[PDB]
């Protein structure tokens, strides 16, 4: 964990001094970047992903476990998923709305969004932003001649930026292990796709030969954009994940719970302790559950001079016990801190304010709102690049007039806070709102036929004339 998440070589930004041409003529440089990514950045991302899947350290670190006769009782709590799903839903659970002053651009955007199911795509990006801290999307002109948008996995994609303060993206790379499922032999073959501002170059490598890039079939392929098609989004200016900073506390909670599970499994709850010199028949001991009287008769010792004295018999129940106060106060502190440092509502120490939920939520999530507003800023910074790409491909296909401009689009964000349609209708119709009958009926589910009802009303209103 620590040695991967907090290493200095992980989470860096790759930069290159030369131009795209200076890089592309010397493809070995890209191999150096790929190797550095595999050796430093990928481990971090794999660890974060494992936590999202709940494969926490406690499950895999079997090295020091005991199972000679006791149970293993190793445990994983899934806080990482709880946190990331909550934070992502709060940010993008409600679709981003688009406004523009020019309807031609607005409808071109809306057409592209509908074709690509952009709502779900945006949510999946927000989720990757939550777990890995960064996310990538690739835009491609499809074989069926349509502009498509696809997410690119963080563990297999990265971008090399211009060294200047402007940090334009010079080139992006994607690489994937190609294998049969039979896992016969060498898993270590990678396909590499290198994206430049004018096309895709395709190569093969394996980790074995030190990743020297070999041209694939169809080794080059032109694309009609005029800038590198991959886009990168950041969770924050450090590109750090949401639970990445509390993984050590999640570990401590795993350990403490597995400790108590061991204590429960391995010690006897209670026993009848019998002391003193005596005869116990193991056949008679089976009556222990059904006897009412326990009679202990002490051994009488006879002295050689004739004295007599008795042994000390004794009997009573004993039971195991542990420091409940201190262990529960400690485990509660860990849980409380995991929620505090992630601005997630601590369900165990929570009270519903009165009867109305929205404003109580806006209070309790105030700390989460502060981070989300920055995430929102970086997200819009990325969406503008997606729009720049879309307008460029539309113009190059002349699917829109070259006169249009896409940077005027206004991205409007809404949080996924709970809402109350009754209070909102009352607030909209008071203060002068208007609603068409069919729409108003469509809002209430007690109408079995929201349209037939209109005819059924016309009949009544007609016979009311007579």
């Amino acid at each position: 964990n620590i040695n991967y998440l907090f290493n200095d070589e992980a989470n860096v930004v790759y930069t290159y001094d030369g131009t795209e041409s200076d890089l592309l003529q010397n493809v070995n440089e890209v191999s150096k970047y790929i190797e550095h990514h595999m050796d430093y950045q990928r481990p971090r991302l794999k660890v974060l992903s494992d936590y999202y899947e709940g494969k926490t350290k406690n499950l895999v670190e079997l090295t020091r476990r005991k199972e000679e006769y006791m149970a293993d009782n190793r445990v994983a709590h899934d806080y990482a998923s709880y946190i990331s799903d909550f934070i992502n839903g709060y940010f993008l659970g409600n679709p981003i709305q688009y406004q523009d002053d020019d309807k031609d651009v607005l409808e071109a955007i809306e057409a592209f969004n509908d074709l690509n199911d952009v709502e779900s795509h945006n949510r999946s990006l927000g989720l990757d932003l939550s777990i890995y801290g960064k996310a990538y999307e690739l835009m491609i002109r499809n074989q069926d001649d349509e502009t498509r948008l696809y997410k690119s996995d963080a563990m297999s994609t990265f971008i090399i930026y211009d060294n200047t303060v402007e940090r334009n993206s010079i080139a992006g790379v994607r690489y994937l292990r190609t294998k049969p499922i039979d896992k016969t032999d060498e898993d270590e073959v990678f396909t590499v796709d290198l994206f430049t501002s004018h096309g895709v170059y395709r190569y093969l490598t394996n980790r074995t030969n030190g990743l020297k890039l070999t041209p694939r079939e169809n080794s080059f392929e032109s694309h009609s954009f005029e800038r590198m098609p991959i886009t990168e989004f950041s969770n924050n200016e450090r590109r750090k994940g949401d639970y990445e900073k509390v993984i050590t506390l999640i570990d401590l909670y795993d350990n403490a719970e597995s400790d108590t599970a061991n204590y429960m499994s391995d010690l006897n709850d209670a026993m009848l302790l019998i002391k003193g010199n005596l005869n116990l028949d193991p056949v008679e001991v089976r009556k222990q559950k059904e006897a009412n009287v326990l009679f202990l008769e002490p051994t009488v010792y006879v002295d050689a001079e004739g004295r007599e004295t008795e042994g000390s018999v004794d009997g009573g129940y004993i039971y195991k016990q542990y420091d409940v106060q201190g262990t529960e106060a400690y485990k509660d502190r860990l849980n409380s801190d995991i929620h505090m440092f992630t601005n997630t509502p601590n369900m165990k120490d929570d009270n519903f304010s009165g009867t109305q939920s929205g404003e109580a939520m806006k209070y309790k999530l105030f700390g989460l709102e502060q981070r989300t507003k920055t995430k929102e800023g970086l997200f819009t910074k990325g969406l503008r690049r997606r729009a720049k790409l879309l307008e460029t491909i539309l113009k190059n296909t002349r699917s829109i007039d070259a006169n249009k401009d896409f940077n005027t689009v206004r991205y409007v964000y809404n949080r996924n806070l709970p809402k109350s349609l009754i209070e909102e209708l009352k607030a909209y119709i008071d203060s002068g709102g208007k609603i068409s009958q069919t729409t108003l009926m469509s809002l209430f589910s007690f109408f079995q036929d929201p349209e037939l009802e209109v005819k059924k009303i016309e009949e009544d209103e007609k016979e009311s004339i007579k």
């Binding site: 050796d39 074995t208 030969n209 030190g210 020297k212």
Partner: protein, 264 residues
């Protein structure tokens, strides 16, 4: 193993955290490359040949490391060492192809080409001897492409001036002689007063397999014996090793294309 004094190995090639005298390299500061990495000269001069299969030969080395060394003394060792292996291979290939040294497996080399054609000049470095060295090539319609030299003789090259133009024939800043680039060999086999030249486009090489690196933790190293003489088991002794292999192939298309200058 159960030995509590550090393990003596034969040969003593295993990296260790604890020296034979018991000194422990804890908190050990990372070394620095006080010399620049060397590069293959025949890969710099010669002509590359697209190849599969064929005549090649395999270079290889295995670097064993104690996992205490790998944990406490120097964690990044293997990553810092891959350049240094690649250098060792480059030097081995250069020394085999150029000087016919180091038990070269090929039956071909520049030293053998020169010794066969007897295209050798006895003499000190002079403008006339440099011109004669070049003329041994142009006699056979071949023009010199570069020079190979021991860097320690620039002191001799600076002392030669063209008596017509009255200027240095050797540009010490460009490191070019008579307008031709001079490449330097660090190997100990090329002596101070010796200089080699040829049309290196006539020297051809190929690389069927680029350097392959595998790191392993469970092999046996039969080539390294414990003090008791039993072979080292990586897993059992808690030790790690890196294997590097490479294939190289060498061909000389015209063995008269090379000439040599040597002290009288």
């Amino acid at each position: 193993s159960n030995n509590v004094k550090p393990q003596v190995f034969n040969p003593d090639n295993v990296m260790m955290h604890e020296k034979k005298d018991g000194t422990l390299m804890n908190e050990f500061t990372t070394p620095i490359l006080q010399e620049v990495m060397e590069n293959s000269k025949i890969m710099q001069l010669g002509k590359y040949e697209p190849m599969e299969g064929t005549r090649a030969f395999k270079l290889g080395v295995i670097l064993p490391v104690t996992k205490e060394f790998l944990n406490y003394t120097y964690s990044q060792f293997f990553e810092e060492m891959k350049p240094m292996i690649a250098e060792a291979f480059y030097k081995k290939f250069d020394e085999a192809g150029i000087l016919n040294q180091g038990n070269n497996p090929f039956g071909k080399s520049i030293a053998q080409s020169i010794e066969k054609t007897n295209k050798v000049i006895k003499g000190d470095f002079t403008q006339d001897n440099i011109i004669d060295l070049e003329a041994l090539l142009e006699d056979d319609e071949l023009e010199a492409n570069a020079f190979i030299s021991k860097t320690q003789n620039r002191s001799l090259l600076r002392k030669i001036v063209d008596p017509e133009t009255k200027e240095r024939i050797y540009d010490r800043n460009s490191d070019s002689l008579d307008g031709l680039p001079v490449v330097n060999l660090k190997s100990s086999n090329l002596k101070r007063g010796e200089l080699i030249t040829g049309d290196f486009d006539k020297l051809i090489y190929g690389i069927p397999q680029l350097i392959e690196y595998k790191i392993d933790e469970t092999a046996q190293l039969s080539t390294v014996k414990n003090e008791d003489g039993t072979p080292v088991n990586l897993f059992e002794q808690d030790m790690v090793a890196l294997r590097a292999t490479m294939h190289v192939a060498l061909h000389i298309a015209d063995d008269k294309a090379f000439a040599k200058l040597v002290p009288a």
